[PDB]
Amino acid sequence: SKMSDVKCTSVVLLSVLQQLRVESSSKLWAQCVQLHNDILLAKDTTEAFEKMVSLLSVLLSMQGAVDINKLCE
Amino acid sequence: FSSLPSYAAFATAQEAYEQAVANGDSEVVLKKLKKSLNVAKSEFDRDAAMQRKLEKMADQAMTQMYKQARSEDKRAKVTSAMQTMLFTMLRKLDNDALNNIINNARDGCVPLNIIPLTTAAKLMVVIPDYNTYKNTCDGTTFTYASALWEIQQVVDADSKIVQLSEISMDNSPNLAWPLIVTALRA
Amino acid sequence: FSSLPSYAAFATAQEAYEQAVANGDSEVVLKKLKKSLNVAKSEFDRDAAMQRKLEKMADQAMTQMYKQARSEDKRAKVTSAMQTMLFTMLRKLDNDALNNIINNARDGCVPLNIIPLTTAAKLMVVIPDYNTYKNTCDGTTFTYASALWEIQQVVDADSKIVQLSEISMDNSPNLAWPLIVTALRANSAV
Amino acid sequence: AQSFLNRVCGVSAARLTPCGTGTSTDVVYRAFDIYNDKVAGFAKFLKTNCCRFQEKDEDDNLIDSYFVVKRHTFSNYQHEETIYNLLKDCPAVAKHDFFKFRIDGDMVPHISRQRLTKYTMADLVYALRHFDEGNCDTLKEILVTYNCCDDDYFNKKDWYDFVENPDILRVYANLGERVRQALLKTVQFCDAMRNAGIVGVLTLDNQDLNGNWYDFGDFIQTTPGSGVPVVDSYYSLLMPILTLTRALTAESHVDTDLTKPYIKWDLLKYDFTEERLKLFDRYFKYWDQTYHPNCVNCLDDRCILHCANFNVLFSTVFPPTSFGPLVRKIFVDGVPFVVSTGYHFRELGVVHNQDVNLHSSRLSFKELLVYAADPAMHAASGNLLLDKRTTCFSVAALTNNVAFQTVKPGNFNKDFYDFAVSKGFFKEGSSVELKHFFFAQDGNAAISDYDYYRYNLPTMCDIRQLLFVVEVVDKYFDCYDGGCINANQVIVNNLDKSAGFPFNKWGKARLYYDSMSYEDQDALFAYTKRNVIPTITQMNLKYAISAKNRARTVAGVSICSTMTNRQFHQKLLKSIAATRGATVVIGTSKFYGGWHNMLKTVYSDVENPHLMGWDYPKCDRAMPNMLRIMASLVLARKHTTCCSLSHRFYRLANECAQVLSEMVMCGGSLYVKPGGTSSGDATTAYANSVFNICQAVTANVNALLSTDGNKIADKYVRNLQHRLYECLYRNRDVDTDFVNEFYAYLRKHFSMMILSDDAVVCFNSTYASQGLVASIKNFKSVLYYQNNVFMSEAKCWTETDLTKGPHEFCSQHTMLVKQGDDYVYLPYPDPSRILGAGCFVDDIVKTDGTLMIERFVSLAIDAYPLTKHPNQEYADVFHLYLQYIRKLHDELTGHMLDMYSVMLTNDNTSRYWEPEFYEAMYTPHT
RNA sequence: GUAGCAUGCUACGUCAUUCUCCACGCGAAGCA
RNA sequence: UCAUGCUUCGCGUGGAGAAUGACGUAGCAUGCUAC
Ligand SMILES: O=c1ccn([C@@H]2O[C@H](COP(=O)(O)OP(=O)(O)OP(=O)(O)O)[C@@H](O)[C@H]2O)c(=O)[nH]1
Ligand SMILES: [Mg+2]
Ligand SMILES: [Zn+2]
Ligand SMILES: [Zn+2]
Q1: Contact partners of B by the rule of 3+ C-beta pairs under 8 A?
Q2: Which positions of chain F lie under 7 Å from any protein Cβ?
Q3: Which pick of B146, C56, D326, D654 has the fewest CB atoms within 10 Å?
Q4: Given 3.90.226.10, 3.40.50.20, 3.40.50.720, 3.30.70.3540, which CATH number is that of B99-185?
Q5: CA dist., res. D377 & res. D367, Å (int)
């Protein structure tokens, strides 16, 4: 149950990005949308994880928006 | 359904009828007692219908209030709930890359751009202190996101180029952190 | 309610029946008083039902006249807000060029699709990729629709000013395409 | 044998080699348009009578120039010589050579035909009309021979596909001039055979791929100057190739040649009546039926179709800025407006509003609606636009900034997912997995999904067969009743739906339905019966869960069009949705035994039943304009008692103005819709069914006509085919006695069940095998040449065991179960669909289960049938849904008692986690 | 025999529920 | 921004009809009382 898991994590991760006003940047939002859609359609889990790394790095690039040290703790 | 004076009257009438039937009294008395019992039962049934309507209305109002309150709560704290859910799911995945980048970003070693997927791609990672530098950067290779990257450049905090040799055990206070390591995927 | 005109008769019959029930009244005649009370109750109940039906009909008629009032209010609001749109875009119609094209028509009818193509004083070009920019909008002045347009402003998908010097083959990847360039007709279709 | 070749070469510089077998006939499969007293049809016959000799030029370099020599009877050889002498002056006649060569014992006559190509025009038409990707050798050879494309072009991934590689269109367009030349030569030939007084029938198979005509067998010589050519089958069979090949593309160049620049058409010019008449008399001179450039003057529906099938072709020559609402300056109280007072339809020609009142005084609510609906003021006052994202013609931008609309990822119901995982779902290798998600899109979602309209190309239908398929379709729709209804009788389900553009800036449809009385609605509807009202139709963006990356856009037609279209079509549409047992199964529920009844109706009494089915790739975006006008014309066949011809034409013009060539509004900017249905007009689901039935009937016609005819053992079907050819290409009036017979034939051997672009057919497998009804290949061919769509094998399905039911209809698979000790067909969904509906939701509020337990009740109602599926995961899905409903009820009761200390435990809520409440939905009682 | 009370049948009015149909409002689900 | 149709479930209000029960008024048959 590790593929349908990354599918749902990508859905929630793109929702979290979208609520951080990432749509205000057309280029970054297009990249995030492409990664999310490719994760949802992915067949092999290796590529899905290597594509989830990029989306999470998009989330982690903006350090002021999300407080990792508190959510993770 | 007790707790009503109408039901008390109905019970009294029923008890009187049950005591009289064994008595076998005059037929006229039995019939008029039956009529009075039926009248009392009709009043009790009317009151029961009223109480059923009132209870149904109260339950409808209570469900409406509960739905309003829970919808307001759901739409209010969406921002916090979404992030908590996201990090719960990322913990659940227990990957090698996601955990690595999250642990690095906790200490402040976040990227400056999207982590690429192709060999001919550039990654720019901000290294906030010498401890994390020694943790990740070893020799002339960078270990970030469960992959090896070739450090092509190390920009000082003031945009000044820094040679990999100048970053040493005692030069650490001298240099102006945070650095920006620009590397290529290997 | 207890305000019905015939409620007095029912109340009096009830009082008489109550008096006859106890205090030492007749047993066989009290049935007559009970029957009188029953008929009075039936009459009063039917009158109350009719009055309640009339009251509910009156309430319904007070929800249909109010609804008509709101319908007419909304009609007036939309009429004003719909003929205030027409006049706004009626003032924006530059009468010089529009009259020029109309009066050259055979019988006053001209296709709609040429009204902006021959009279509009501003052009918006949406460019998806840089090859299209180079082909169509390159430079500050370009030619389109047999007219000369001088570029006035270039913005990207984020609606941020993009200088003409920032649109290059090497710097193309750093822009948020499509680019929206709003040229202005030069010397009225020169 | 050497002497025979020496004599065939004749007195000419002919250096030719043999193709036969040394003075013997050559066997060859060639397409023939044949109509004898015994056979008829446009089939592919093997006729072995000639002896081709291929010419060599440039010192052994082989070319395509064949000296087709044939042996004749000496009785019709004399006749074919006295007919060629008259016609030998024409430049459109291949040079013959008559010579009697002593072969065995006598001087048997020979008729050599000099320098003919390998294939004829009939071969090209048959190759394109009957297109099968498995044996398209002739089409590839024709394409290669005439430099359309290199021989290695066909090693491409699905080269033929019109969607995967649009470049194939270009490859076809290189035949254009060729075809055009042929047309010109045909006219020349006709003139010749009229000057010499020669009565004959022109067929495609007597014209090589250079235009030259070479057969004069059935030409009788009448008095000079009054010979009549017969060109019905010729022009009709050739029609779909004139637009597929873009033949008249050379009419856009000065002096009509591709080596000169485009003619600079005047911009103010909108009336091209004289140009249309010139083109008609230039290419179709000897077409008998009268052609009205403007279909305002057309007599009936069968004339509107005929005269618009020509306008679709002639409108590709004229500039695209001339097609649109004609705009005139009117004064209202002294303030000059700019309102639309006409239209220039690519198909219907120029239409002028009848009661145009310039110099009015005041604007009534109806007139304000009309003036604010049409794009005259909007496009006139807006600033020019050149949108390079799309290929569609862009009119104007209504704002100073482009509006970009995105699509949100879609929320995740983590509670249901956790529950399902705890119940063993979503494991590795499990047969049930997540396939349906909410896909997110960038800022160009709407414009891209709109630009998908590039698949709508101008299609010139074969008019002689369309005019028969229309009668058979109308027969299919003859069990209903329709007409115009007053504004009192119009039923509007939901009035909280948007009123399109610009009317959504001030309210919903409720505001515009309650703010103008029935008198105003009747006045507007009566206005549209003699005026054309153009409208702007916003292109919305649907938000739904699917398995494809396709952000579907739907047309938000204005309220002005919707009100009138409702009044016009509501009675017929409500009658189509209240009839049980018809081919169109719109309005039939799948519950309470509806699915079983529908299936048992489709099966009917077909003798050797096989099932087949299809689903059009882009039904709305690929549909040609002719078929949509046809659908609108057969939906209006019910107004024979309430609307006159003028009223019906102006209603057709209004429909074409606002749902066929509308001016869409895709994000603060006006574009021009190329064509095809606007999914969102008042008849979208019922105009797709007519188009579906039209395609099916066309497939049957082509399947029956392309059959040999000599090989049909059944003497009734042979006469049916002969009479069908007579009714198509030898009659101009409708023969109801045979329309009824062909309809009965189709009903008996080809049972349909239609719902929009989704069809299920139970057909006689023996006939389909022999070629007497439409197989799936015939339907694919018809789609290729009449939709500009190649229907891949993903959209098609076939089932040779009808006890398994349709493989897929309306996304619902069918299975035969044991219901109530009886065997019935039940529809079950895709389990991924139900699971993904549970896991992912639209609104964030829906992610709290206790709020919405009716979501899961409805999803369990839909997922109940899976309980009987032999696979166990599919039944586990339904049990999971019931268990989750129980969990939600428990949690709701707990929360309610925890917050408001009032126990809430009813006995009527325990039936939503019991299977009986859901079994009752599929038992045929209610 | 007139009037009143008791028993047996028919008609009308008012209430108490159960069910059927429709007219509408509200929330939700599927399908083209 | 979210169109046109069809179908189904949930709840609420209104109208009509049917079923059982209750009370009352009226009509017909028998019994008892005032005259
Ligand atoms: O939400 C919808 C879906 C469909 N429709 C109407 O039904 C038609 C067919 O709707 P389908 O769902 O069958 O899709 P499609 O054939 O357009 O495209 P593919 O999925 O095959 O690629 C549409 O083109 C439109 O006419 C709607 O009006 N609304
Ligand atoms: Mg489809
Ligand atoms: Zn005509
Ligand atoms: Zn009509």
Answers
A1: A, D
A2: 1-12, 21-25
A3: C56
A4: 3.30.70.3540
A5: 14
